[PDB]
Structures are given as structure tokens and as C-alpha cells.
């Protein structure tokens, strides 16, 4: 039950992939400021279907070489461009609770960051998966989309009736 890049090659543990969507109206996953944050700390899906996003390093704590479903995962963004103010922030994804939008996926350093692990789960292009969060050190919530205000921003939050269907493209 290996997870496969849209070239039918299994995800390398510790490798960089773009997490493309299935909705061709839509682009890759990246980071954007949202409300009163100045650094780009919210994990968003691009609206620009031509946008591959930021390549994300996908890692399991196990010594597997190949990510199979249901393995625990940590995802962090590779290097990208921020204003000089924000240089050096942590790019590993966190789910931080006690927020209006529901449990939000964030980067940087957040107080209420839920403890837990990500897993990948097949949905069936047809190399489609969804991302789940499993709290607290097997009920996991589906990472879906929450659309914003003056923005229109589709921000990743833990959504029961979620899911965002995604695929993965290896970074060369």
C-alpha cells in the first residue's frame, strides 16, 4: 500500500514533492498571511491553476524508505521567499486548535499546536490521496478547505466533511 507520485513511483521518505490538487480550477499548496499575521504562516491551496506551489519534504519517523499509507508523517516546506522580517521561521506543518476557522494547519511557531501525526490515505488522473491528522502523541480528521473573507483564501483546516484530494509531483 505504497503512496505513488503521479509518475507511479512511490514517495521517497524525506523527498520533496509538490502536492498538486485534482480540481484543475486549482493549484499547489503554499503559505500565505491570513488576518493579522505578517509572516506567511497559513497553509493555503493556490487558486492559480498554473501554480505548482512550494515543494514539501515528506518524512516518516520509521526507517522505511518508501511512504506506505497509514504511516505517520511530518511535512515541512522547503526553502521559499519571505520578507526579511520573517527569515528563519519554522516551515513544518502544525495543526493549531482554539481557532475560529476550526483546527488550522499553520507553520512557524504556534502556541496551541496540537500534538499528533499526519497520515496519507488513498482515494484513487487516479493517483489521488487525502491527508489526515491523528491527534495526540485511530480517529483522524480529514484535511479539507476553509475559504476566507476579504481574501477568498482556501486555507487548509481539519474538516470532518473535508477532504482535499491531492496528488504528488516529485521535485527534480
Swiss-Prot record:
It comes from the Eukaryota. The record marks 63-64 as: Reactive bond for trypsin. Disulfide bonds join 39-86, 134-140. GO terms for molecular function: serine-type endopeptidase inhibitor activity. Keywords: Disulfide bond, Protease inhibitor, Serine protease inhibitor, Signal. The keyword Protein biosynthesis does not apply. The keyword Signal applies. Inhibition of trypsin. Belongs to the protease inhibitor I3 (leguminous Kunitz-type inhibitor) family. The sequence of variant A is shown. Electrophoresis identifies three genetically distinct variants, A, B, and C, that are inherited as codominant alleles. This is Trypsin inhibitor A. The lineage of its organism: Eukaryota, Viridiplantae, Streptophyta, Embryophyta, Tracheophyta. The gene is KTI3. The chain holds residues 25 to 201 of 216 of the full protein.
Amino acid at each position: 500500500d505504497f503512496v505513488l507520485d503521479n509518475e507511479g513511483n512511490p514517495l521517497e521518505n524525506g523527498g520533496t514533492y509538490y502536492i498538486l490538487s485534482d480540481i484543475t480550477a486549482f493549484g499547489g499548496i503554499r503559505a500565505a498571511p491570513t488576518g493579522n499575521e505578517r509572516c506567511p504562516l497559513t497553509v493555503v491551496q493556490s487558486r492559480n491553476e498554473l501554480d505548482k506551489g512550494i515543494g514539501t519534504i515528506i518524512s516518516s519517523p520509521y526507517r522505511i524508505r518508501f511512504i506506505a499509507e497509514g504511516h505517520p508523517l511530518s511535512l515541512k516546506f522547503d526553502s521559499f521567499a519571505v520578507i526579511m522580517l520573517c527569515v528563519g521561521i519554522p516551515t513544518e506543518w502544525s495543526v493549531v486548535e482554539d481557532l475560529p476557522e476550526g483546527p488550522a494547519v499553520k507553520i512557524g511557531e504556534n502556541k496551541d499546536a496540537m500534538d499528533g501525526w499526519f497520515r496519507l490515505e488513498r482515494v484513487s488522473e487516479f493517483n489521488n490521496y487525502k491527508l489526515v491528522f491523528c491527534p495526540q502523541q485511530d480517529k483522524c480528521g480529514d484535511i479539507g478547505i476553509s475559504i476566507d473573507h476579504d481574501d477568498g483564501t482556501r486555507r487548509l483546516v481539519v474538516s470532518k466533511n473535508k477532504p482535499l484530494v491531492v496528488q504528488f509531483q516529485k521535485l527534480d
